[PDB]
Design a protein around this ligand. Sequence first.
Ligand SMILES: O=C(O)[C@@H]1C=C(O)[C@@H](O)[C@H](O)C1
Length: 255
Amino acid sequence: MKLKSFGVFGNPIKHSKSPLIHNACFLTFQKELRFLGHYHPILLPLESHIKSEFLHLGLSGANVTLPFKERAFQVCDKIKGIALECGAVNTLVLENDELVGYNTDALGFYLSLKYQNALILGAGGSAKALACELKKQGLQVSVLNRSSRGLDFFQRLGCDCFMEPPKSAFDLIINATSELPLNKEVLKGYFKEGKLAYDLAYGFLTPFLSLAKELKTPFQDGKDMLIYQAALSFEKFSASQIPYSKAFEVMRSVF
Ligand SMILES: O=C(O)[C@@H]1C=C(O)[C@@H](O)[C@H](O)C1
C-alpha cells in the first residue's frame, strides 16, 4: 500500500498534542484505512498561505490552529458542514482535487461539555465556533474583547457584544483568547457567581484556570475538547470510514 501525509498548521506549534493522538490512530487503523498515515506539526509563517502550503507539502488532510482558523475559512475552495456558520475552519481534507474545509471545534466543544448563558473571552476561530454552537443550543451568549473585530459575525449570530465587561452573572465563562485575559477583580466576580470556568488551552495550567481553582470555581481545561475535535477530524481524514467514537477511544488511551 501507500503513504499519506497529514498535519497541523499553527504558529506556535511545538506544544500541540495532535500528532501524538493522530499517529496512534493512523497506526491502529491502518488495515481498514489501507494506507500508511503520518501526521506532522507544521509551523507556518504568519505571512503564509494555508492553501498553497497544504498543496506544496502534498498533504491529504490537516488540522489548523491559532492563529489560522478564520484564514483557513477564507482560502478553502469549498466549505461544508457546520463550518459554514462558524466563519472558521480547523480541518482540511483534499477531496476531488479541491481543498475542502470543515469545523470540528463546534461539536468537539459540545461533546466536551458535561447552563443558561455564557461569556466568551476572545474573537478568533475558536471563539467563533463556540458562539455558533452555544447559540445553536438556546443559550444566551455574550462576547467580550478589547477591539471591535468580529462584531459583524457575533452580532448576526445574535450574541451580545461588549468591550466593557458586562456587570452580569454568567453560568459559563470561557477563555477562547490567545497573563490573565481580564482585570483580576473583574474575573473574580465572574467566577464567584459563575458555574464553570472553561479554558481552551490544554497541557499546561493557565492564569485564568489557576484563578478559578484558587477561588473554588469549577473549572475545565481544553483536553477533552482537543480529543473530541481530533476524533472528529480523523473521521473526515478516513473518508468517513472510521467513526469518531472509535478514533476517540484510541486518542483518549494514548493521552
Ligand atoms: O493540536 C491543537 O493544539 C489544535 C487545537 C485546536 O484548537 C483544534 O482546532 C486543532 O484542530 C488542533
